[PDB]
Symmetry: D2
């Protein structure tokens, strides 16, 4: 992918780049197309100095990527159901995740601007799931190619589960990426639960190795745009100040990979799952 129009400053070899010399407010078609190519190359891009970006322009920009979420309940900007308000007080959780993978159609990506927050504190990290897959040895890539996993959530107000390939192809690059994440993946469907725990434990740690991640410090006016299909992210929980972001969410992913090479694991009647590793029975 050719991207030569702007001044691009990559964060790490794995992913991330800050793009200078762009004004989002009245971006042209040609400049948008270039930002989209930079997103496909760098997975998350950062656009500094966009203070004052109008609501209408933010929505138009998001709609250049696809349909925008109009969340039923999460607060939105007055007059604009597509611009979601994220407040550290109103709702943090530092855990590696890919957004909404407990649903059959997770988002394609998001546009986030932190409009209020501390000068230091509250960094966001992203990880490169292409590299997480590619860094596995050949026998393990071949195994994962034929597996699926159940992703689920069960909290007050939301119960959802979905089955996805463990390895998905990015529809627009054709490259394969890992598609499990600590927050929302439950278990691999074709393994028993204990085998699944062991393999997922390894994959979660490996996939978020420092060599596969980047860490971004938010500044006034900074916009992050990321591809949810091939990344995880993590919100660092190291601040107590009020922190507010404006977020637009682009819907419409269908994670797709190889046909599974085995049936789901079927337990016998009465079989009990005894995890090999301790988790407490009571949270906080």
């Amino acid at each position: 992918i050719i991207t030569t129009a702007f001044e691009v400053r990559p964060l790490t070899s794995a992913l991330g780049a800050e793009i200078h010399g762009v004004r989002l407010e009245d971006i042209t078609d040609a400049d948008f197309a270039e930002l989209r190519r930079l997103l496909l190359k760098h997975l998350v891009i950062f656009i500094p100095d966009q203070e004052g970006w109008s609501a209408e322009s933010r929505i138009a920009f998001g709609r250049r990527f696809g349909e925008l979420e109009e969340h039923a309940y999460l607060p939105h900007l007055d007059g604009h159901p597509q611009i979601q308000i994220i407040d550290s007080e109103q709702n943090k959780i530092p855990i590696w995740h890919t957004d909404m993978t407990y649903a059959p159609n997770p988002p394609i990506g998001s546009v986030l601007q932190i409009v209020d927050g501390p000068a230091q504190g509250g960094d966001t990290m992203w990880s490169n799931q292409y590299l997480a897959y590619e860094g596995l040895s050949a026998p393990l890539r071949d195994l994962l190619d034929g597996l699926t996993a159940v992703h689920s959530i069960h909290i007050p107000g939301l119960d959802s589960q979905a089955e996805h390939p463990v390895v998905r192809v990015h529809p627009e690059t054709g490259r394969r990426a890992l598609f499990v994440n600590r927050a929302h993946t439950s278990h691999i469907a074709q393994l028993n639960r204990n085998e699944s725990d062991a393999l997922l434990q390894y994959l979660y740690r490996f996939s978020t190795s420092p060599e596969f991640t980047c860490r971004y410090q938010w500044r006034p006016g900074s916009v992050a745009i990321w591809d949810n299909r091939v990344t995880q992210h993590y919100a660092v929980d190291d601040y107590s100040e009020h922190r507010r972001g404006l977020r637009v969410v682009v819907l419409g992913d269908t994670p797709s990979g190889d046909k599974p090479r085995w049936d789901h694991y079927r337990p016998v009647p009465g079989q009990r799952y005894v995890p090999d590793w301790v988790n407490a029975k009571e949270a906080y």
Copy 2:
């Protein structure tokens, strides 16, 4: 403790002994007192060849130890609410546990006879919690002496939790024993959940080392009597035949140890527990 009356065949150095030359049916006071001393020395004792032991004698024997459970719902022998029927079909679960530690007053012990089952298969193992504590190095014994743990269960029909010392004294021997177990212990109260997971993971494995356990193969007419205050046990899940036992449960333990040396750990508002080790979100 002096025990010289019968022929005693210890199973292992850690615990367990088979007692020959005893007839439970009309046991004398003096012979019972000797069996009780052998229980305090060996933690679990096995009495072979007791086929035909009458219901009235089984209940009288149990009552020599204390008050007998008359479970509200678990099935009991016709005419005898104290003799519980345990059926592999009607209700197994192979997990190390101490009985009912999710309650404030777990049982003192049990008398179990397997009246129907396979010739091989379905062994029971017991562990010595005195040795599990004593085998910890001095800095760790000193730490555990001042901790407590929450034990809990949440299944259809039963929700219960209780806080117990991590190290308890046996009231009748004065010796200290570990009092956590994989099945029912949730978390150590004075640690955060992640620290608790790490320490409990170590203790669970260490406490069930082969050097601290014994394994008993059931035969027709065999009776096992064990002290629930200072043991764990584990039912091996390696058979498919029907397996039936008659069980009498002696109530009335209060696990007691040192006063805790620290307050309970208090999380901050909104704090989320993220286990360091994967467990699946969906059981079977």
Copy 3:
């Protein structure tokens, strides 16, 4: 005539009614059958078994080891003396898998020891393999592992299939063990650690093992090709065994489906889990 008493459904059986001293070819054929069925068998009441008969018995199975340095019975280089003092190690292992030709099996008799303490456990490696789900069995069928040992006076390593096919039964068995397996050759070391850690624990589940309490005159015979065993370290009394070791195994499995993992120059192995750098 033999009465067979299985210890567990997974493995192990005590065989009564046998006299090893002058066993006939036909009775030996039955013991052989029972060893292929039960993997380890225990023969009680053999006090006095002569040295010449013990050696002839082992030779029915194959060539006997004449260890250069282990003490042996005066006059009989094939009958090894195993003394808890002179030599224990409580660790799950399969014997000598760091060698290209491990033993087929062993015949052991604990002639001195405490009345309780010092049990030996065995595990069923057929069940350890069969209990894995289909995707994982498929993976392991195509893998090999390096087994090694590095102690004063012994350096050895060997590569073996992770899943071997027993030559007589045709049944597949796991062939890794905690004591001597180093790493799976086709994975990187960190992936290897994670998988082996799971397999070691799973393979010694109580549902796959048995535990034997030694009695005077009892002989244990086991197939080292499809078992692990573990010597429980819960005694301090003197414990002596007489052992004959049958050589000649060549673990055989599928051709690997992938090449060895090749690190890049200067690559460092950083284990994900801590081990101390200093032993005792």
Copy 4:
């Protein structure tokens, strides 16, 4: 005059408006204060810093290492040349803790390298200790640990408190690190493994670390007494740094509250977690 830009709330700050070449005693006092506050500081725009000034700067902190074998700048034995080719290792460590007197700290400038790739991370060992719950802090205060290294041309070990008191701030900091700590001396090895495994992961939580992208002319200065650091291994281009190392630390903590764990004769350490027996 200095503008301070913290990287994270845990640690790290970039200091603009500084000229190291002829820094005054009073301005140095301010840098020293900022190092005790931020643990690692980054000074951009120092291209051309003279060798004599670089050495004088390090000498303000203490005695400089003159390594016998590491290459150094022609004419200047104190200015070490660190080349990605000639010498990386991505592993969390505190420098030379296998020695009884580790460095107080270092001054590093990456003079050649890629525009992206090769970040360095640091962690705050004060926060790693303070984030433990009270029972565990109480335990660690009374423990010590053996740190060691065994490579061709270097064997060293040292015993240090698990929790050290920084000499200037009086604040307590964890003093174990994954690369060089072997085991806690007062526990058995298996207990030690379990606790160190927890501490290593906890101590390098994202909430306790920072990540720095090197730029031409940037100098990093850090306090090795209360940090770990990690060199990210995500590049293949040539990377050269100039480093001055300040010697003279003696980690100090509470007298241990227990004796060393003493194994019995013949006791074997069997780790609960697998590590391969062969590296690369």
